A and B are shown apart, each in its own frame.
Chain A
């Protein structure tokens, strides 16, 4: 009545079914702003306080249609069988295989008919190298053993006489090699056939082109730059210590593990690509990559226009909670309000302390002049309590117990009966429940227990107090083990025909 809370609501807050909000810090649920004394469910309080997120399963063998760190819109399919129900930043969870594209910059020669060759100072990927009217046989200018290295498209030949390479030839698309790996070739025998138009592969680009005119032919010394992929398999007990698209060098570790011999170390300069994640995590969040030391750590809560990283350069866009990613080297803010919404008699006691009695009396007085009969009625019923407290000098918050009194022991005896056996009052068992639950609560607090546990404990504590003061008033009555008999609480002691008044007071 005092706080204007229906029985169901007060039940929900005291017994931890629902949160109630104090100093909302401008939260928003479904488009409507949040103001004090609003009733929030568990999902609502979690979405508001901890932000909105979800994770989706990826069936075996299937890869991602999206990339790590990439913003996503609701409805956008992350996989063929996966569609995100929300909008935000997708993140990879437990990638099964890591592909490394290794950077290789080398030098390789080729010889072509002068009429066919299209002269250029460099060749971009896919760009036509030459146009040949008739089939042409590229021949070896050295003797030795052939090392054939085949890319996705295009090939490399390396002639080594001594095991020391004496030649490197480049074979762009359109040249079918006539030699196998490890074949012995003499000078002037065809290593390839060129047909029609020959062009650069998509994998390899030609950075520099030198050309020596000799007779009717040109010899192109090509300075080439290309990437060679290598796949690595990641087991469930292994973690990826490297971010998506990270430049790595020989000796650095891409993926750690339990034991050093199963580790993945980078053999050569290359870029890292994370493929086939176990699951994909869609979060509503704002990403803030950083090039230097970060001013805020993980777990800190921050408003828009706040310092994040790089000595005050990159700042906060939205409201949220700070997750600092060292792996991806990015400060990620999951969007969440700072809203304070409590549960139980602590919240209620707070609201009670925050009641200004005179003010509410004025409110109800102004309410008493309303034409509606029901409103005048309820305002009268409320003003009766308000004025009761006002006239009495009792503080409303005293209806909440910080310190639960303990009856003198002689009034709840532990007594040795005739046979030396002990008999005792139920109040002792009630008090013991209370003290056990309270102590466990203090230990669970001091040890930093998760919220579900503390919530359960608090609920149990309230119910314990209930059982002590009035047993069976709310919920199932507390009974002793191996008996259906309700324990006798203080209320029971007082009232009824067997109660203190009628039994021991009005008669003796």
Chain B
């Protein structure tokens, strides 16, 4: 029913490691990685492919999918070929395979055992724009990074090194996903810094600070305009479904006109404009009207150069420019005469 409760149950299934269990798991993982590198040395194959194969057989055929980094599409066929190629190796070499498998299994068990930590850390990041479950999952990604990067040699407990990567992943997630209009992480940092600065400033000023005071507190490079624009780009959008009035019958989006699609008046005006221009078309001769339509882009929509209309009508560019000039001139005279195209100039 409640997804969080359900997940907390599934987490409550796997029991917490002891110091020895943790050390052994970490050790098996590390030695497993070493073994994969050794198998890469022996076989002369790609360590990543080998790792994906060992992980494939450990996880089973229940999960097999093409890895973005891998060169070959990963399917039961290829993993069977590679597995059999790994079965083809001498006892001391074939040993490293067992080391690798044990490594993967240890990795899985390590993560699964440490899933509680992620929750305990993520519970404090709520209200920051991501759901609890999302924070948990991103924190889990962090946990995975921590597992693959851990060194048991340092004798530090796993939680210490894990917490860093977990917080890292949660915060990266918050910075990356939380805005409908996405903002770069460094810019999010700058914005949050501006917020904290303004909040401290207001905490000592007994009022909200001006742009100038914030600019002062931000240091050199920061003036009022920079603070103002930074606050401008930080603005988040509002819902179109935002309710208006005490009833349920009015949306905020109902008050917003469409500026894109031309109005009936605008459309009709463009229509009468085209029709009237064609009047003056039949007016000027065929050639000068066509030259004007080519140069102004009424024909294909592009505006031709003098050399193009000149090569088209078979005259010099000077000539075509001259007939364009006289065309425009006759149009000017006729326009002064009939005052027809004046009203379309607003």
Contacts and interface: CB of A to CB of B under 8 A. Distances in A.
A448 interface: yes
A258 B52 CA distance: 29
Interface string B63-90: 1010110000000000000000011001
Nearest to A435: B177
Given A422-B181, A429-B180, A452-B112, A299 B137 contact: no
A27 to B, nearest CB: 15
A292 to B, nearest CB: 7
B169 to A, nearest CB: 11
A494 to B, nearest CB: 14
A428 B98 contact: no
B184 interface: no
Interface string A212-245: 0000000000000000000000001101000000
A414 interface: yes
B291 interface: no
Contacts of B127: 481-482
Contacts of A437: 134
Interface string A273-308: 000001100000000000011110111110000000
A448 B134 CA distance: 19
B247 to A, nearest CB: 10
A15 B2 CA distance: 10
Nearest to A410: B260
B42 interface: no
A298 B98 contact: yes
Contacts of A449: 111, 140, 144
A447 interface: yes
A280 B310 CA distance: 98
B142 to A, nearest CB: 11
A423 B252 contact: yes
A98 to B, nearest CB: 15
Contacts of A447: 144
Contacts of B105: 298-299
Given A422-B237, A440-B137, A485-B239, A326 B111 contact: no
B55 A94 contact: no
Contact of A292 (B27, B91, B112, B133): B91
B297 interface: no
A417 interface: yes
Interface stretch (A172-180, A260-268, A363-371, A455-463): A455-463
A17 interface: yes
B238 A422 contact: yes
B293 interface: no
B314 interface: no
B252 to A, nearest CB: 7
A196 to B, nearest CB: 51
Given A298-B98, A449-B144, A425 B241 contact: yes
**Majority secondary structure of chain B interface residues (helix, strand, loop or mixed):** helix
A297 B137 contact: no
A76 interface: no
Contact of B65 (A340, A422, A446, A482): A446
Interface string B135-167: 011101100100000001101000000000000
A93 B256 CA distance: 70
A436 interface: yes
B253 A423 contact: yes
A409 to B, nearest CB: 12
Given A236-B19, A326-B95, A460-B134, A480 B239 contact: yes
Interface residues on B, range: 35 or more
A236 B23 contact: yes
B115 interface: yes
A115 B62 CA distance: 81
Contacts of A488: 241
Interface in A424-455: 424-426, 428-429, 432, 436-437, 440, 443-455
Contact of B141 (A340, A423, A440): A440
A64 B181 CA distance: 63
Contacts of B251: 498
B222 interface: no
A326 B91 CA distance: 11
A460 B3 contact: yes
B50 to A, nearest CB: 13
B326 interface: no
Interface string A403-421: 0000000000111010001
B98 to A, nearest CB: 5
A60 B242 CA distance: 65
Contact of A297 (B87, B134, B138): B87
A112 interface: no
Contacts of B138: 440
A324 B54 CA distance: 14
A475 interface: yes
A297 B98 contact: yes
A42 interface: yes
Nearest to A425: B240
A17 B155 CA distance: 39
B11 interface: yes
B102 interface: yes
Contacts of A278: 18, 20
A301 B141 contact: no
Given A423-B253, A445-B63, A295 B87 contact: yes
Interface string B35-69: 00000000000000000100101111011010110
B250 to A, nearest CB: 9
Contacts of B177: 432, 436
B321 interface: no
A220 B321 CA distance: 136
B141 A424 contact: no
Interface in B80-134: 86-87, 90-91, 94-95, 97-99, 101-102, 104-105, 108, 111-112, 115, 127, 129, 133-134
Given A424-B240, A453-B140, A485-B243, A298 B101 contact: yes
Contact of A460 (B55, B133, B144, B238): B133
B248 A498 contact: yes
B216 interface: no
A463 B7 CA distance: 14
B57 A236 contact: no
A334 to B, nearest CB: 12
29 contacts: A16-B6, A236-B19, A237-B152, A258-B153, A293-B90, A293-B91, A294-B94, A295-B87, A298-B105, A324-B101, A415-B256, A417-B256, A422-B235, A426-B239, A429-B180, A444-B140, A446-B65, A446-B68, A449-B111, A452-B112, A453-B115, A459-B7, A460-B137, A475-B1, A475-B3, A481-B127, A482-B127, A488-B241, A498-B249
Interface of A: 15-17, 42, 93-94, 236-237, 239, 258, 278-279, 292-295, 297-301, 324, 326, 340, 413-415, 417, 421-426, 428-429, 432, 436-437, 440, 443-457, 459-460, 463, 475, 480-482, 485, 487-488, 497-498
What 8 pairs between A and B have smallest CB-CB spacing?
A: A298-B101, A422-B237, A94-B20, A299-B58, A488-B241, A293-B91, A324-B98, A448-B55
Given A239-B27, A279-B18, A481-B129, 20 more contacts: A94-B21, A236-B20, A293-B91, A326-B95, A421-B238, A423-B240, A423-B252, A424-B238, A445-B65, A446-B65, A446-B67, A448-B59, A448-B63, A450-B112, A451-B112, A453-B137, A455-B10, A457-B137, A475-B1, A488-B241
